[PDB]
Amino acid sequence: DEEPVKDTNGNPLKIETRYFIQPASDNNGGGLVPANVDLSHLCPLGIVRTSLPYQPGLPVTISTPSSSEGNDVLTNTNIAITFDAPIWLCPSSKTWTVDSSSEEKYIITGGDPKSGESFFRIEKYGNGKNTYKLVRYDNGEGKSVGSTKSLWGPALVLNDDDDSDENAFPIKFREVD
Amino acid sequence: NDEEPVKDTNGNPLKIETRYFIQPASDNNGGGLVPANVDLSHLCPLGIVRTSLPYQPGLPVTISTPSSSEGNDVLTNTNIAITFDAPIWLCPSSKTWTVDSSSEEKYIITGGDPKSGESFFRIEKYGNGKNTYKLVRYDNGEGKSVGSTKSLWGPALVLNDNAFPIKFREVD
Amino acid sequence: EEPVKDTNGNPLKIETRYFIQPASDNNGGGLVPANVDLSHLCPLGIVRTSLPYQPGLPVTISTPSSSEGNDVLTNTNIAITFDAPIWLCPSSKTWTVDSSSEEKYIITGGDPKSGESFFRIEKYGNGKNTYKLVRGEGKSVGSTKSLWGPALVLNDDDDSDENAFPIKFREVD
Amino acid sequence: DEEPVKDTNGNPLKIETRYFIQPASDNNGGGLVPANVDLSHLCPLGIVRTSLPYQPGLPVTISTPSSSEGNDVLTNTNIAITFDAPIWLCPSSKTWTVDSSSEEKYIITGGDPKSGESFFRIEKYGNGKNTYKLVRYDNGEGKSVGSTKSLWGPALVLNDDDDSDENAFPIKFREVD
Ligand code: CLA
Numbered sequence A, D: 001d002e003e004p005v006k007d008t009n010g011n012p013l014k015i016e017t018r019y020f021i022q023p024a025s026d027n028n029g030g031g032l033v034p035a036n037v038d039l040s041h042l043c044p045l046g047i048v049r050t051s052l053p054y055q056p057g058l059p060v061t062i063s064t065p066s067s068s069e070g071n072d073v074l075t076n077t078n079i080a081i082t083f084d085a086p087i088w089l090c091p092s093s094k095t096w097t098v099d100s101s102s103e104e105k106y107i108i109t110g111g112d113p114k115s116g117e118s119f120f121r122i123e124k125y126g127n128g129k130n131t132y133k134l135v136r137y138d139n140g141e142g143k144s145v146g147s148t149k150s151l152w153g154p155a156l157v158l159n160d161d162d163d164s165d166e167n168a169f170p171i172k173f174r175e176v177d
Numbered sequence B: 001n002d003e004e005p006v007k008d009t010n011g012n013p014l015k016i017e018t019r020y021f022i023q024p025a026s027d028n029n030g031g032g033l034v035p036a037n038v039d040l041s042h043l044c045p046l047g048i049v050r051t052s053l054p055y056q057p058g059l060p061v062t063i064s065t066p067s068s069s070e071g072n073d074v075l076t077n078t079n080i081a082i083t084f085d086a087p088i089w090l091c092p093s094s095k096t097w098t099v100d101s102s103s104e105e106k107y108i109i110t111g112g113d114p115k116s117g118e119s120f121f122r123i124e125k126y127g128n129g130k131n132t133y134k135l136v137r138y139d140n141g142e143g144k145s146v147g148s149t150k151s152l153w154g155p156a157l158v159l160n161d162n163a164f165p166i167k168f169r170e171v172d
Numbered sequence C: 001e002e003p004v005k006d007t008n009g010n011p012l013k014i015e016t017r018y019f020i021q022p023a024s025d026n027n028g029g030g031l032v033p034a035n036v037d038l039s040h041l042c043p044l045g046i047v048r049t050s051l052p053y054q055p056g057l058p059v060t061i062s063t064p065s066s067s068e069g070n071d072v073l074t075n076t077n078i079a080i081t082f083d084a085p086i087w088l089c090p091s092s093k094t095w096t097v098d099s100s101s102e103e104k105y106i107i108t109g110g111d112p113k114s115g116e117s118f119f120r121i122e123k124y125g126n127g128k129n130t131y132k133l134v135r136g137e138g139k140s141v142g143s144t145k146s147l148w149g150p151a152l153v154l155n156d157d158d159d160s161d162e163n164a165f166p167i168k169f170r171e172v173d
């Protein structure tokens, strides 16, 4: 719970800083971007892995509840992920959160920055360096963020647990300058 | 006062909780009024636009009467609420018309509370044409009528800061 | 070769706007242009709208033969073309079978004068003014689940009204 | 002419090589991408400067009609530009050409890289290193590629002249590793 998260260059992640959250896994597409999960709703937005190979993803900024790391972002700690964008087609926030009414638990936008529903934790994934997985604790239980088939491709969804990395969607943080 | 029954294209009095297409008075170009984005900055909520396809009737609405319980006739000059009727909705808000108070155009949009003063309009006779009306809203004192402006897909209803004449066509 | 009839029992005339509407148990409305998948926006497929009161997009009918008056008779090569004041794709509003793909989607952009877009309208079941499309005449037009909903597709080597998409024509005015 | 076109790293451009064609005028946006120019047609596609800050643009590969200078690309020489993508929503080709039928003379996709109607010329552009501009040839006169306001943003159009860089949309080429 004390090992600071690092970007693709091995440097410590910092808040108020832009990063591309890119799949560490299957290198046959691009980064994570907003997109609707299905044709039932266009808002709020889900999180997909773009199929276009050199599209980096839409940048995010990592926020922190209590000044206890100055600007640093530590592992197994409460953080909030917010897409950074000059344009937003939905009347809700860009902060990540979970769709509880979704009977599939898609990771969606619209979450509240300071609220606890938008809380996620970054854990080390497997053994690759600077590689991680995301995990949320809805009501005490720990579940890792995975992915599932959606309209536009694989969309981030909450798994039933965090017992093993097997179902986790591995990610890396690439600094945007 | 003055409060007479609003009538549909067949001259029949309007009934609450009944589907009607709201269509522009003159059957010139386009079809009925439908939900559509007004610009490229937002998908939701939705504006009210006249479709340019000539045989599209428009998306039906139901009318509810806020301040009244007096039979099932909709009357002119009486607060009423307008709600689109559809089996599906792509936005995370209601199908009720209201005013986009915070837009320099005062677009009429979806997502209002059918029981809040925000979503109340009054139907008044328009010009000569029989069974022709206009929608009017009161910020409270003085009333402004619903007109239109050009938007992404076509004319979009806006609160006039002439009115956009409409008629009601019973569904089926 | 008896006349195809609309919902009023009137025979269809060529170059007259008609709504093609699903002659079956009714969840949705008429046939309209829509994209079949996320791989292409153009050309367009034929999809049944899920909205209750959407008539469908209008279509006109044309005949390769020019000696049967203006009557659109059953079992006679005809060309179905969407009628609209605007079109967002480079090709034609005429229906045709996507020669190549799996489900042989019926698509837009055909040549009303080419035999590539000729269809046949024939009686469907022992009903009233209910038909189907076939393609001299042998493959029946059925449907299959697509992006927006049922999309028209040509069926394999069969015409029996078991896997055919039931339709009625409603005159527009 | 004989001089080589250089990418952002000052290296010579090569054929069959993916590059991002990025605007050199501002930092108020991202690279060049396919987008429809107006609501009248979805296909073919125009070339628009995306407003999203970190979108690099959709890669393009450069081709030479002639089988002369191997895989080299030199200024003042005839070349065709073609988008590179595993997905394409329009029937037509990914090759750039001029829409001679529009009053705006929008640069659109669907051209024939082998036909002279898709050929363009990369020439130097005023201030800054490795900065260029594109010019097309009517017959005897050159017309630089500029841009005009379109539905989704600045769209490339064929200018009137090439008397100055004044109305030319400057670009640079960034190799897509
Ligand atoms: C509100 C609805 C919404 C929807 C529908 C989408 C949908 C999509 N976005 Mg997201 N996005 C949104 C809001 C939305 N976005 C917002 C508010 C932002 C902040 C501005 C972004 C930022 C963003 C980024 C940074 C990226 C995406 C990308 C994508 C695409 C990912 C799948 C893919 O790789 O296909 C492969 C790609 C294609 C088939 C070409 C897509 C062309 C798009 C731009 C327009 C399509 C137009 C038209 C409506 C076609 C759909 C028809 C419909 C019937 C299916 C997908 C089309 C990624 C992408 O690939 O963009 C091009 C990407 O890199 N989006």
Ligand code: CLA
Pocket (backbone or CB within 6 Å): A042, B031, B034, B035, B036, B037, B043, B044, B046, B049, B050, B051, B052, B053, B056, B057, B058, B059, B086, B087, B088, B089, B090, B091, B153, B154, C041, C051, C054, C086, C088, D039, D042
């Ligand atoms: C979520 C956002 C949303 C948006 C973007 C729209 C947008 C639109 N709607 Mg509304 N609608 C919505 C939600 C939405 N709708 C909901 C929730 C309902 C209830 C279920 C409806 C019910 C509805 C009806 C009943 C009707 C409309 C119609 C229309 C069109 C009116 C303008 C016109 O006449 O063009 C003329 C038509 C065209 C140019 C062809 C239509 C093309 C559409 C289907 C797709 C465009 C997407 C394209 C691939 C990407 C380009 C996007 C552009 C901004 C660059 C316009 C495209 C009218 C229409 O004509 O529909 C076809 C109409 O009759 N809508």
Ligand code: CLA
Pocket (backbone or CB within 6 Å): A036, A039, A042, B043, B053, B056, B088, B090, C032, C033, C034, C035, C041, C042, C044, C047, C048, C049, C050, C051, C054, C055, C056, C057, C084, C085, C086, C087, C088, C089, C148, C149, D042
């Ligand atoms: C070029 C691409 C294209 C595409 C993708 C579509 C797609 C669609 N059309 Mg078709 N259409 C087109 C061209 C196109 N059209 C042309 C050129 C014409 C002639 C002008 C028409 C005429 C037409 C008619 C007359 C009708 C359709 C309708 C429909 C809808 C049928 C499914 C349904 O019942 O949902 C029900 C409706 C909804 C789920 C809400 C959708 C509202 C539409 C208007 C806009 C959606 C925009 C949204 C932001 C797209 C993003 C998707 C995301 C995955 C990227 C579907 C959305 C039917 C319809 O229901 O229209 C509303 C209908 O009646 N279209």
Ligand code: CLA
Pocket (backbone or CB within 6 Å): A052, A055, A087, A089, B037, B039, B040, B041, B042, B043, C041, D033, D034, D035, D036, D042, D043, D045, D048, D049, D050, D051, D052, D055, D056, D057, D058, D085, D086, D087, D088, D089, D090, D152, D153
């Ligand atoms: C077929 C029609 C088509 C159309 C309509 C577009 C349209 C667009 N493309 Mg292009 N594109 C296409 C085909 C198409 N594309 C193809 C075949 C490819 C190769 C696969 C691409 C590859 C591509 C790339 C690589 C990129 C684009 C981008 C964009 C956007 C640039 C403007 C901008 O900066 O907005 C700023 C962004 C927004 C307003 C939010 C993005 C919304 C997108 C994802 C969906 C829009 C559909 C929406 C439901 C309907 C409109 C609603 C209205 C209220 C806005 C614009 C939305 C750029 C972009 O910004 O992508 C996200 C970009 O980087 N496109």
